Structure 1
């Protein structure tokens, strides 16, 4: 489980799915053997592409991911590893200068999703190639420029042996939406207004604008 103070809960389950879709390069964590620090790999993870219809909740759905099979994290997972995948969205430092109140302390507004469950390794070549093609389809659509993978499928197949594809059955899903909900209404407005004025912070202002 993930610690999320009451005020930082998403208004709706759909916000956690939106952050996963918007920020697919997750930090995949699993336990380190013999009391060592956890293993951490940045990996591209998407929602099950076979899910037709609105996906409102992460709990009960399967995420699809891959990493490098030669990455020692792949061997360390073994068979039924309990893992967390952390998705990190828009974030910005909050200067109390923005509050125009006193006294105060600074903070950092940020967005995260933590999904936990059992990681199963894909061994099937068909399921592995489906994983990377669904990942092209999902990320090129949201982040890309209309690139057509069709002419590169032979190439995908040539490099496929190196792919460690996986499936993560989401047992638990938690979302930090730390967006100044602890402040009084006028101060939340001052913060939202200050973040509206620059590209680095507009995405945070966007989420703050959608709070009930």
Structure 2
């Protein structure tokens, strides 16, 4: 694959990858830099095709929707059909060997990531640009927000729309890192799960550890 994920760190099910994309829509969008420059990286909001009905169990084959600032050089750098990766970063925590209570050991960092790759297609119609930002509000306000109603701002969205660079990303490949102590003996994995259960900052990691088979 285009992402290195050791055997024990594969998600139980394809659905875990879709879940992380929905949970952490603020992706890092990467494309090659010009003439041996470092990749361009932009934090961009990205959602699953809102027109999708049926349960979404796999990212491969679906289109993702996103936007960025047109004034961002990254926008002009993407040219035409640019091959890109968007990386989505889920729950994560430092793992002290103190938690293991074993010797010898080394520390690690438990973390979740999804990398999707395919060709970014820019949206140049204002109708499709407006669809992108309205679809994003509907998906993010419901999951992360405080019941705000976009209705009073629909004209405003249109009155500020030129700055938006909207895009579509057909997922050619999807890889998921779920690094959640699978490499450890079960009694040690229990100790990490129970440690992470004891603080809010680490509880989401404990929640994924608890759903592993």
* TM-score, reference length from structure 1: 1.00
**Cα drift, residue 145 of structure 1:** 1.1
SS in 2 for 1:201: helix
Name structure 1 gaps, 5 residues minimum: none
- Map of 1:129 onto structure 2: 130
Deviations 1:56-111 (A, max 9, x none): 00000000000000000000000010000000000000000000000000000000
Once the two structures are superposed, residues 96-149 of structure 1 have per-residue CA deviations (whole angstroms, 9 ceiling, x without a partner) of: 000000000000000000000000000011000000000000000100011110
What are the equivalent positions in structure 2 for 1:184-203 lying under 5 Å apart? 184-203=185-204
Q: What is the DSSP-based 3-state SS (H/G/I as helix, E as strand, rest coil) of the residue aligned with 2:71?
A: coil
Instruction: Supply the distance in 1 between the matched residues of 2:109 and 2:170 (Cα, whole angstroms).
Output: 31
Q: CA deviation at 1:52?
A: 1.0
Give per-residue Cα distances to partners, 1:168-209, cap 9 Å, x unaligned: 000000000000000000000000000000011000000000
Distance 1:47 1:9 in 2: 21
- Tell me the distance in 2 between the aligned counterparts of 1:42 and 1:61: 21
1:54 maps to: 55
Any stretches of 5+ residues in structure 2 without a counterpart? none
Over the aligned positions, Cα root-mean-square deviation in angstroms equals 0.3
1:83 aligned partner = 84
Give me the whole-angstrom Cα distance separating, in 2, the residues matched to 1:107 and 1:122.
41
Equivalent position SS for 2:77: helix
* Aligned-partner Cα distance in 1 for 2:75–2:121: 11
Q: 1:54: how far off?
A: 0.6
Structure 2 CA distance, aligned partners of 1:114 and 1:179?
17
Q: Distance in 1 between matches of 2:160 and 2:44?
A: 17
Name the structure 1 match of 2:166. Answer: 165
* Superposed structure 1 runs of 4+ greater than 4 Å apart: none
Residue 64 of structure 1: SS of its match in structure 2? strand
Cα distance, 1:53 vs structure 2 = 1.6
Q: Does residue 1:112 correspond to 2:113, yes or no?
A: yes
Q: Which residue of structure 1 lines up, in the alignment, with residue 43 of structure 2?
A: 42
Mapped to 1, the partners of 2:8 and 2:157 lie a distance apart of 45
